[PDB]
Amino acid sequence: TVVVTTILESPYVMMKKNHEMLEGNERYEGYCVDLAAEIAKHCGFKYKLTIVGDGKYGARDADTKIWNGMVGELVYGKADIAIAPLTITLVREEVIDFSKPFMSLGISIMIKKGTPIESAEDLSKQTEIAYGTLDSGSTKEFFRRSKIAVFDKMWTYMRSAEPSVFVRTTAEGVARVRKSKGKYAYLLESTMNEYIEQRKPCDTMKVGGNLDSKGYGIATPKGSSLGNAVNLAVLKLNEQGLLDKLKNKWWYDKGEC
Amino acid sequence: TVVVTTILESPYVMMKKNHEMLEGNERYEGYCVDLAAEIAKHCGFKYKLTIVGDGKYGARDADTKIWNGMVGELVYGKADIAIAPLTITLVREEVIDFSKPFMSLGISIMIKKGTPIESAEDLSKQTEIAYGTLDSGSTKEFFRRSKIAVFDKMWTYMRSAEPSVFVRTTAEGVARVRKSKGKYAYLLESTMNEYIEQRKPCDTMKVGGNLDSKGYGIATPKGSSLGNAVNLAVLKLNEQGLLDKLKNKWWYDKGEC
Numbered sequence: 020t021v022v023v024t025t026i027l028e029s030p031y032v033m034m035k036k037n038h039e040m041l042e043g044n045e046r047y048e049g050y051c052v053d054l055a056a057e058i059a060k061h062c063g064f065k066y067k068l069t070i071v072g073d074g075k076y077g078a079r080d081a082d083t084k085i086w087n088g089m090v091g092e093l094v095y096g097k098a099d100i101a102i103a104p105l106t107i108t109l110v111r112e113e114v115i116d117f118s119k120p121f122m123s124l125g126i127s128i129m130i131k132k133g134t135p136i137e138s139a140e141d142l143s144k145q146t147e148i149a150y151g152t153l154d155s156g157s158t159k160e161f162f163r164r165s166k167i168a169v170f171d172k173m174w175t176y177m178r179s180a181e182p183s184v185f186v187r188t189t190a191e192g193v194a195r196v197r198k199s200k201g202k203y204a205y206l207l208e209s210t211m212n213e214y215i216e217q218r219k220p221c222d223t224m225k226v227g228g229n230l231d232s233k234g235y236g237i238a239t240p241k242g243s244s245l246g247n248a249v250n251l252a253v254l255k256l257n258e259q260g261l262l263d264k265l266k267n268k269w270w271y272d273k274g275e276c
Numbered sequence: 277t278v279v280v281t282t283i284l285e286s287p288y289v290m291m292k293k294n295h296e297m298l299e300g301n302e303r304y305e306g307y308c309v310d311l312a313a314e315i316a317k318h319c320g321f322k323y324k325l326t327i328v329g330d331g332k333y334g335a336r337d338a339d340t341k342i343w344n345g346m347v348g349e350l351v352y353g354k355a356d357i358a359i360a361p362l363t364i365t366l367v368r369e370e371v372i373d374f375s376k377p378f379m380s381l382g383i384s385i386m387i388k389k390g391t392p393i394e395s396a397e398d399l400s401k402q403t404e405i406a407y408g409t410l411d412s413g414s415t416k417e418f419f420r421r422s423k424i425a426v427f428d429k430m431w432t433y434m435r436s437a438e439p440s441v442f443v444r445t446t447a448e449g450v451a452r453v454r455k456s457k458g459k460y461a462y463l464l465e466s467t468m469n470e471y472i473e474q475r476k477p478c479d480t481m482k483v484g485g486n487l488d489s490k491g492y493g494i495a496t497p498k499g500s501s502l503g504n505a506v507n508l509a510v511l512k513l514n515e516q517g518l519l520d521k522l523k524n525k526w527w528y529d530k531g532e533c
């Protein structure tokens with residue numbers, strides 16, 4: 020039985036309302052739960068869904084050099100495969116293997132409905148509406164390094180802004196938008212932006228195109244015997260239209276706005 | 277010296293106007309020419325850009341089961357790496373290796389400006405404005421195999437439409453749009469649609485969102501000692517913002533509309 024590590028994140032993996040009366044994999048529902056089933060079916064293996072211990076995605080401590088989250092669970096041998104909204108990055112690709120992207124995304128802008136902002140440019144040219152990002156992560160690093168006037172301009176602003184425009188968690192950014200009465204815009208991964216826009220109280224919306232492009236990939240350890248098959252299954256699923264069908268299902272068909 | 281196989285296609289690889297006075301790699305310019313330079317730099321190797329003999333990207337003959345194009349060059353050991361707008365697909369991934377995608381794309385709709393069509397659904401509900409695709413390839417196949425009502429209806433229309441709505445080449449499809457006075461819409465890869473839209477006579481435009489999602493990747497023979505390194509380089513370049521810089525450079529900065 021293959022040990023799958025994943026993370027409780029909506030709408031990827033969530034516990035059913037009546038989960039206490041259910042067993043094993045049947046306790047969970049979500050985009051990645053359906054995806055795992057598809058992958059396992061096409062690859063031909065039985066599996067067990069396990070929630071990542073520390074509830075993290077995967078980063079290496081610059082001091083201890085220890086990997087946390089799902090990535091850590093793979094390199095230290097606790098799980099055989101990770102099926103989650105795990106962004107494919109250079110540092111992670113150096114210690115584990117990623118299938119080709121099963122979902123595309125990018126940095127996007129979240130505003131409280133009514134806010135007079137339609138793009139990253141609109142934000143850069145004004146200050147009445149504050150805007151920020153997580154105090155760490157690829158989004159912050161993106162602006163921090165962007166040599167693009169519109170983005171670097173936004174960076175200088177964000178850094179010299181008072182009070183701080185940075186938040187520690189995603190939930191904090193989203194709440195700051197909903198409670199700032201239109202005076203705060205939040206930069207985050209488009210997938211989450213699009214998802215929140217379809218959830219009550221339906222008071223936020225995504226605007227403008229994405230600022231960059233990345234993808235989520237299924238991960239397996241170097242040399243894994245699952246690596247190749249998994250990659251081919253992801254491609255097959257996308258080509259059969261299943262990936263788009265699952266996106267629509269969990270984001271819109273189950274939407275509330 | 278690394279032997280790179282590529283193909284002359286705008287704005288990826290093109291012979292400079294004064295190419296006869298230039299030599300080797302210097303004869304060419306474009307997105308893939310710059311990308312090739314960047315990859316080689318980071319990976320630290322010397323290379324030679326060679327143009328695929330048959331002018332094909334990579335398809336397996338159903339009868340002989342022989343691969344043509346750049347895929348063929350890699351599969352049969354004629355080239356070390358392919359740097360071009362080569363779509364990552366299941367059938368290709370089974371015979372060669374692909375780096376993570378360096379560019380995203382999808383099937384899109386090209387219309388001559390003024391055409392009263394905003395989406396694929398719009399096209400599917402009528403026949404006044406004819407629409408088609410290449411007489412062969414993944415776009416045609418996408419429609420042939422789609423389970424989506426709108427797309428399946430579009431397929432049935434295209435297959436039975438007279439005169440034939442299919443074209444032999446990309447240039448023919450675009451030309452047909454431009455000379456049909458808005459009575460012909462062409463379905464093609466978004467990247468080409470967005471490029472042409474920025475080119476005189478500025479009489480075409482992309483409408484609606486893409487119908488699917490895929491990407492171009494750098495390819496190497498299965499088990500190539502270059503594969504790993506090149507893949508890591510692509511991720512690094514995307515993280516450094518170089519891939520977007522190049523896209524903006526060849527599509528928009530050098531724009532004419």
Ligand SMILES: CC(C)(C)c1onc(OCP(=O)(O)O)c1C[C@H](N)C(=O)O
Binds near residue numbers: 153211
């Ligand atoms: C998956 C979800 C949408 C919840 C997510 O939203 N923001 C994230 O990270 C912050 P940043 O994008 O700044 O690194 C992540 C997690 C990210 N995809 C990862 O793989 O670490």
Ligand SMILES: CC(C)(C)c1onc(OCP(=O)(O)O)c1C[C@H](N)C(=O)O
Binds near residue numbers: 333361
């Ligand atoms: C890259 C470019 C935009 C020139 C292109 O436009 N149409 C193409 O194929 C036809 P289809 O998409 O029908 O397979 C390709 C080539 C394609 N990316 C491939 O890898 O074969």
